[PDB]
Amino acid sequence: GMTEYKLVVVGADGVGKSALTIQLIQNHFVDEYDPTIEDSYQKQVVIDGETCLLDILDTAGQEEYSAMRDQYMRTGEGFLCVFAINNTKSFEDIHHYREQIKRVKDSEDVPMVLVGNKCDLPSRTVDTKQAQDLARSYGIPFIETSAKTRQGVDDAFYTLVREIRKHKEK
Ligand SMILES: Nc1nc2c(ncn2[C@@H]2O[C@H](COP(=O)(O)OP(=O)(O)O)[C@@H](O)[C@H]2O)c(=O)[nH]1
Ligand SMILES: [Mg+2]
């Protein structure tokens, strides 16, 4: 058989949410993708031997309330919370996004993965260990990625699927 997973990608604009999503759905690096486009994208993959259909909401324009975004997040099964490792502000914003998720999911056990993107870049400002501390305080995995080189992309999305699987077993 197959299983579907409803995923949401959140984080400051410019962190690489669209680039990460497109690496998953199309397997290459799209460096210019309209920063205002928010949409969902479907991709069939295989994870741990199981056929999986992922439906991924790539968020954008979070400065304005969107009812469609809110309804998708309310029913979303798991969340990637993305920052860029060369942008300290995007890391400090993670708290805002996790609050926003737990605010709309009525739960403190929501499948989530913290993602530090742009790890191909040399001028890092957020140490891996600082991000590991934050993920531990939330009880969630931390995965480093580069949408440019594809490093860690499958790891981030597949780890989220694995977290959802465990949650659904409860
Ligand atoms: N070097 C590098 N640049 C990236 C990476 N991911 C995204 N970018 C660039 O970061 C900027 C924002 O990417 P985008 O996917 O539009 O981010 P979004 O606003 O979160 O959807 C663009 O200039 C991308 O080319 C990455 O992993 N490495
Ligand atoms: Mg985008």
CATH of the domain at 155: 3.40.50.300
Report how far residue 118's alpha carbon sits from residue 96's, in angstroms, rounded to the nearest whole number.
Answer: 20
Q: Do 29 and 147 meet the contact criterion of CB atoms below 8 Å apart? A: yes
Number of domains in the chain: 1
What residue's CA is closest to ligand 1, atom 14? 16
Instruction: With beta carbons less than 8 A apart as the criterion, state whether 18 and 80 touch.
Output: no
What is the CB neighbour count within 10 angstroms for residue 135?
20
What is the SS3 assignment for 119? Answer: coil
- Report the nearest-CA residue for atom 13 of ligand 1: 16
Q: What was the elucidation method?
A: X-ray
23, two tokens: 């690496």
79 lies in which domain range? 2-169
